[PDB]
């Protein structure tokens, strides 16, 4: 029965119940249903008008908190002598909820999510005075042509949604829409992306938002700067389906749900909850 | 009253006399794809009796040292009967499932089965960064044994696995769990040979224990597809 | 007492569940202490490459 629930439910008073046939404490877990034993039906209650709002447990309010999804300190200098592995004043980033575990465990509570990403790009700068650098954050789709240089002609943004912003400005906030080809983001994808057997397991590219190619629009300055670009994603307009067990073991990788666990309890493989002495030993005991 | 249950699908039928109930998963009964949700434009073949019936999988020996068993759907059924031939000949499928897991023992045995149907069970390998390959996931009709079912082989918790559609086979109380699964995918239809929506998971939370003569107690699984559609006809692949 | 016959196992089991009721309520949202992150996860540098 679907009903609008704004506050937690009231408790009716109850009296002495001595009745054959009606055993409300006795329930069947084997049916899979959670026990419907009301607190009135189990113990003797008073009338309580419960005014506690349930609004902070809304899945919209649960997940619409702008959490960190990307962070790169990258050097901002002459890159004529640097190696061809570091960021030559730009970084591509396939937009990925899996990189940071606080938002990842929250989004992996559910199986399917339908949200709009409210990407806030916080750029901060340190010296190896601070410059007022202008940054471009060109939104490239999944697999499309990502730039090769800082001053390459992919940054002209004929159709890719670039956002130009400065360090001295407030952080650039754009709204990435619901960009899955399916009706929800498959947070877990039990299956393979490709038709051949070489495809990566669990990684649905429909779950992938796209690339976030971020460069610094200014040319290279005679001193080098370490520019750290933090990206904050706020899921919004959130519809969520099929909740899951929250992940207890520590994450190993962003590409999959591999597990190793801690060496000892808590959150270990053989023992998730921290150990105690016996089953009849109370750890936090009020001894006076 | 709810202990007896006959499930008539197609030419198949299953009675059970110690049943708990049957779990219509997330309060949702399977149906065909409606026109407002439909995507593939061609007329889907709906055989309605050649596939909508109980395909009984191979039984697995419920023992003392057993960790668990898992069957990924429809990967368990992509080579069985007319569901398998419709899978191999079509690009798309949309089918709910009616899993009926059979496991009985005497009134002297003890044990508990977490018969839980996990949607989108992205497994994880243990103590490595390499993703599980094709052979580690797509076991087929045989199914797979859990390696660490206490964490459900994906770092999550078995303790919270009752958030999924589940029933219990407590050998004290009942001997058959029945979970009626709808179409659980973000897409309306999907390619069956490279994706599995539901994963039936069967876990020994309480192991098989008795003091009598140790008869073989197996766990038989009878998965019936429900409300099958199939679009995109072509040659078979297998 | 737990009283079993000679053919049942003498050491029976109890599975303990907990849910909450309709009275239940939560507020003052915080980040979970159940998960941590000491370093970057594996292949997280490969999401930038």
């Amino acid at each position: 029965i679907e009903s609008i629930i704004k506050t937690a439910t009231d408790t009716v008073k109850s009296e002495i119940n001595a009745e054959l046939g009606v055993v409300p404490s006795l329930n069947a877990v084997e049916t899979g249903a959670t026990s419907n034993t009301e607190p009135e039906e189990a113990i003797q209650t008073r009338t309580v008008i419960n005014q506690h709002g349930v609004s902070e447990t809304l899945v919209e309010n649960f997940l619409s908190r702008a959490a960190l999804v990307s962070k790169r300190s990258f050097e901002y200098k002459d890159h004529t002598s640097s190696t061809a592995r570091a960021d030559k004043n730009f970084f591509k980033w396939t937009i990925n909820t899996r990189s940071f575990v606080q938002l990842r465990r929250k989004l992996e509570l559910f199986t399917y999510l339908r949200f709009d990403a409210e990407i806030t790009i916080l750029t901060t700068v340190a010296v190896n005075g601070l410059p007022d650098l202008t940054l471009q954050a060109m939104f490239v789709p999944t697999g499309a042509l990502t730039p090769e240089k800082q001053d390459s002609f992919h940054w002209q943004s004929g159709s890719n949604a670039s956002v130009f912003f400065k360090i001295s400005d407030p952080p650039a906030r754009i709204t990435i829409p619901f960009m899955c080809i399916n009706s929800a983001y498959s947070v877990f994808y039990d299956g393979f992306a490709g038709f051949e057997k070489n495809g990566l397991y669990g990684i649905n590219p429909a779950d992938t938002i796209g690339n976030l190619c971020v460069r610094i629009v200014n040319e290279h300055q005679p001193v080098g700067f370490t520019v750290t670009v933090r990206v904050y994603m706020k899921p919004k307009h959130i519809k969520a389906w099929a909740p899951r067990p929250p992940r207890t073991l520590p994450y190993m990788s962003i590409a999959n749900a591999n597990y190793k666990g801690k060496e000892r309890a808590p959150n270990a493989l053989s023992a998730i909850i921290g150990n105690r002495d016996s089953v009849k030993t109370m750890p936090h005991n009020i001894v006076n | 009253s709810d202990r007896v249950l006959q499930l008539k699908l197609g030419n198949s039928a299953i009675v059970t006399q110690e049943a708990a109930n049957y779990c219509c998963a997330y309060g949702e009964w399977p149906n065909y794809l409606p026109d407002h949700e439909a995507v593939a434009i061609d007329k889907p073949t709906q055989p309605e009796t050649a596939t909508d019936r109980f395909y009984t999988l191979k039984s697995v020996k419920w023992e003392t040292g057993s960790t668990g068993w898992w069957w990924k759907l429809p990967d368990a059924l992509n080579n069985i009967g007319m569901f398998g031939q419709n899978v191999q000949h079509h690009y798309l499928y949309r089918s709910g499932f009616l899993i009926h897991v059979q496991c009985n023992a005497t009134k002297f045995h003890q044990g508990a089965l977490l018969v839980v149907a996990i949607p989108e069970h992205q497994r994880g390998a243990h103590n490595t960064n390499t993703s599980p390959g094709f052979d580690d996931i797509m076991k087929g009709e045989e199914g797979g044994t859990f390696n660490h079912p206490y964490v459900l082989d994906d770092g999550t918790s078995l303790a919270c696995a009752t958030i999924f559609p589940h029933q219990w086979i407590n050998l004290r109380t009942n001997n058959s769990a029945t979970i009626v699964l709808p179409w659980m995918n973000a897409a309306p239809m999907d390619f069956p040979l490279r994706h599995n929506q539901w994963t039936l998971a069967i876990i020994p939370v309480v192991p098989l224990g008795t003091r009598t003569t140790s008869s073989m107690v197996p766990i038989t699984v009878s998965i019936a597809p429900m409300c099958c559609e199939f679009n995109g006809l072509r040659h078979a692949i297998t | 007492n737990l009283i079993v016959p000679s053919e049942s196992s003498d050491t029976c089991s109890l599975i303990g569940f907990i849910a909450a009721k309709d009275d239940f309520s939560l507020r003052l949202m915080r980040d979970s202490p159940d998960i941590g992150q000491l370093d970057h996860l594996h292949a997280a540098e490969a999401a930038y490459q």
Partner: peptide, 30 residues
């Protein structure tokens, strides 16, 4: 609340959907 954009996804978060149905989880049986 404000939403001076031309796209309905660009609005603020819809923190008003108080409709809940726990009986598809706590009582998923038929």
């Amino acid at each position: 609340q404000i939403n001076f954009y031309k796209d309905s996804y660009a609005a603020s978060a819809s923190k008003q959907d108080f409709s809940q149905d726990p009986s598809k989880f706590t009582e998923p049986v038929v």
